[PDB]
């Protein structure tokens, strides 16, 4: 996996060149927004359980057939698996937010997922709805103005939205 910093280094090397002032300046800026990134991760992570549970309740209220007998989330074994999958999707998304790169999310979570649900018979599009849900809650909790120093986090939120959309698109 790579973090936003190693990502630039890897590109510089393949060309065999030193970093340019543009790159230094760009990376120097990531460092400046560091505080906002630590808060985002802390908050989302700090509400992990609520985010997963509330999103699933909504999913099931919206698509009751997933829990009717025969449904893919019917029986506690399949239900636990469903909840586990959601918590896992959320876990890798928070890693990407800390890293500032989706590599970890792609290599260790998203690849092979589509094939896996296809083979299991799990409605991949239903998973997309699940993650879309956590996305909204996650961001709502991330940039809530209460409890912290005021300032703009809009760019970080849009980036955070990216990783979520990225996962949703990988199974839908």
């Amino acid at each position: 996996m790579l973090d936003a910093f190693a990502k630039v280094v890897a590109q510089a090397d393949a060309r065999g060149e030193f970093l340019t002032n543009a790159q230094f300046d760009a990376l120097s800026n990531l460092v400046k927004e560091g505080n906002k990134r630590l808060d985002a991760v802390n908050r989302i992570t700090s509400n992990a359980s609520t985010i997963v549970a509330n999103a699933a309740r909504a999913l099931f209220a919206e698509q009751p057939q997933l829990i009717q007998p025969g449904g893919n989330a019917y029986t506690n074994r399949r239900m636990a698996a469903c909840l586990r999958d959601m918590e896992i999707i959320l876990r890798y998304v928070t890693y990407a937010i800390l890293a500032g790169d989706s590599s970890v999310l792609d290599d260790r979570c998203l690849n092979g997922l589509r094939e896996t649900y296809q083979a299991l018979g799990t409605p991949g599009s239903s998973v997309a709805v699940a993650i879309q849900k956590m996305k909204d809650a996650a961001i709502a909790i991330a940039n809530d103005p209460n409890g912290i120093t005021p300032g703009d986090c809009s760019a970080l939120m849009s980036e955070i939205a990216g990783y979520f959309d990225r996962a949703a698109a990988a199974v839908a």
Partner: protein
């Protein structure tokens, strides 16, 4: 690649859990140190050529036989001298990568892995590179924590070579 950030998530990942305050303090640790690291990287990059040209000479001065002796592993030929300066630039370039990334990662993947094999196969002597690194160490002209950062990675290279 090994950085304070990837190390932080790898730890959480093997334990199969979410990041905690433990890992977060580590990332803030690197974030705060970045200031001195970036300063080092910038200075090394702006003075790359003179440090490289200086380091090469320091090597030729200490091991004069590398300029007269015959063989493709020596710099007794314009070709050998180009390869030599090139190799020095590789070392310098790698330590700046380590400063920007905040870890040994870049150097480990790109330079340390396979080092001994290479120096063995092409009859290249480690002390030649250790000499070039010592020159860069004594003449980068950095002070304070910017020097501590630069030296940390230079010495790291020295140890891999010995």
């Amino acid at each position: 690649m090994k950085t304070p950030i990837t190390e932080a998530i790898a730890a959480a990942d093997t334990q199969g859990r979410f990041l905690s305050n433990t890992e977060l303090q580590a990332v803030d640790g690197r974030f705060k140190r970045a200031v001195a690291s970036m300063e080092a990287a910038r200075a090394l990059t702006n003075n790359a050529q003179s440090l490289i040209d200086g380091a090469a000479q320091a090597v030729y001065q200490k091991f004069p036989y590398t300029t007269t002796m015959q063989g493709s592993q020596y710099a007794s030929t314009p070709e050998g001298k180009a390869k030599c300066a090139r190799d020095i630039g590789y070392y310098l370039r790698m330590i700046t990568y380590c400063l920007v990334a905040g870890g040994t990662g870049p150097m480990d993947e790109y330079l340390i892995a396979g080092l001994s094999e290479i120096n063995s196969t092409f009859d290249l002597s480690p002390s030649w590179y250790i000499e070039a690194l010592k020159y860069i160490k004594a003449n980068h002209g950095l002070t304070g924590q910017a020097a501590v950062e630069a030296n940390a990675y230079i010495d790291y290279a020295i140890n891999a070579l010995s």
